[PDB]
Amino acid sequence: RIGKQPITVPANVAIAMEGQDLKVKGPLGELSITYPREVLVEKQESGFLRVRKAVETRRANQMHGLFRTLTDNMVVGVSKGFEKKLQLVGVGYRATVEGKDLILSLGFSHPVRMAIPDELQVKVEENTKVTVSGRDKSVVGQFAATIRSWRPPEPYKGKGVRYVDEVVRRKEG
RNA sequence: CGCUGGGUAGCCAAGUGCGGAGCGGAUAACUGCUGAAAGCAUCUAAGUAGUAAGCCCACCCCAAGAUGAGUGCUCUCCUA
């Protein structure tokens, strides 16, 4: 059910457990998440945390799986790191990086200057397709969604900022 | 004021001057991000992003009778 999970913590990954808190100090960043109430973890004498619902209800059962896989996103975050991929399909459409900014050429009257934050290391290895990388999967999310949310792909066109390997309905007219 | 022409100030306009803003914060519909309940999924249950002439502040004018009667820098006299 995912309620029961084994926390795979590889080497290099400090699991700083504190009273309703986890500070992971991993080789790529020190990510920090607080526990909810019913969800109680203990390190299980190996590099494997176990969140264990303390009080019996359904809301506990809810956040058991929830927070279990939150921590999993933390660990895999700092160690393996998250990627993300986009593809500015079409005429004209092309992006380029200005170190701290990501400027987009999307057929608008004006190029769209998406100033990125620091937590996110983006790049354009091929003039069309974009690449985002980051430590925390949520932030990577809001960012890639944001980039998509300027020219989400059109059906007929078939051809906008469709992040990689995402299915795109198409039509005749 | 007989009827007419012309007219300063005033008041007027069909004249002139300016004005509806970087606004910023929450939102509704909606699109989302991470994600289990439900060993897939789902915008949601935890938490977060965007976003409307709509809401609030901003703008402009009153306003401490706001009896909850505010604030302070000056005054005014202690001789019966």
Side-chain angles (χ1 to χ4, degrees):
Chain A
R1 70 161 164 266
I2 302 289
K4 60 205 177 181
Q5 190 179 31
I7 326 292
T8 297
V9 176
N12 293 281
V13 182
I15 305 302
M17 173 180 70
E18 298 86 358
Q20 289 187 340
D21 175 68
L22 177 63
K23 296 284 182 66
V24 294
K25 300 185 185 300
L28 275 62
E30 294 179 351
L31 183 62
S32 304
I33 287 179
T34 307
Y35 306 145
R37 292 299 300 276
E38 300 86 353
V39 176
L40 179 61
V41 64
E42 287 304 318
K43 182 172 177 289
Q44 194 56 58
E45 297 306 322
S46 180
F48 299 99
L49 300 173
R50 291 182 179 275
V51 300
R52 294 180 177 277
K53 55 174 290 183
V55 60
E56 298 301 318
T57 182
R58 183 173 60 83
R59 182 176 180 271
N61 286 334
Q62 305 295 99
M63 296 192 287
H64 191 272
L66 173 61
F67 184 76
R68 176 71 71 184
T69 195
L70 290 173
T71 61
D72 188 7
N73 288 283
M74 296 175 75
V75 172
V76 175
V78 290
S79 66
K80 178 60 164 57
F82 302 112
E83 293 84 359
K84 192 64 170 173
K85 300 290 185 290
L86 281 72
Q87 184 179 356
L88 275 62
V89 182
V91 179
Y93 296 132
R94 62 183 303 281
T96 191
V97 185
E98 291 181 351
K100 192 65 183 297
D101 295 344
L102 186 144
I103 185 168
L104 293 164
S105 180
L106 294 173
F108 291 158
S109 63
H110 298 79
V112 177
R113 181 176 181 171
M114 177 65 69
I116 72 173
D118 58 353
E119 296 301 325
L120 301 171
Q121 55 183 14
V122 297
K123 64 189 184 69
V124 185
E125 60 188 345
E126 178 69 17
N127 281 279
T128 64
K129 64 191 183 72
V130 178
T131 296
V132 176
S133 297
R135 175 177 61 254
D136 180 68
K137 190 187 288 179
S138 179
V139 177
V140 176
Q142 289 176 337
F143 185 87
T146 300
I147 308 302
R148 175 178 173 80
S149 298
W150 290 93
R151 297 296 293 268
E154 293 178 349
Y156 302 102
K157 180 76 178 302
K159 192 164 71 68
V161 181
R162 58 185 184 87
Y163 59 81
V164 178
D165 61 21
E166 186 274 338
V167 59
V168 175
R169 180 69 62 177
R170 285 185 181 173
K171 292 177 179 175
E172 176 186 0

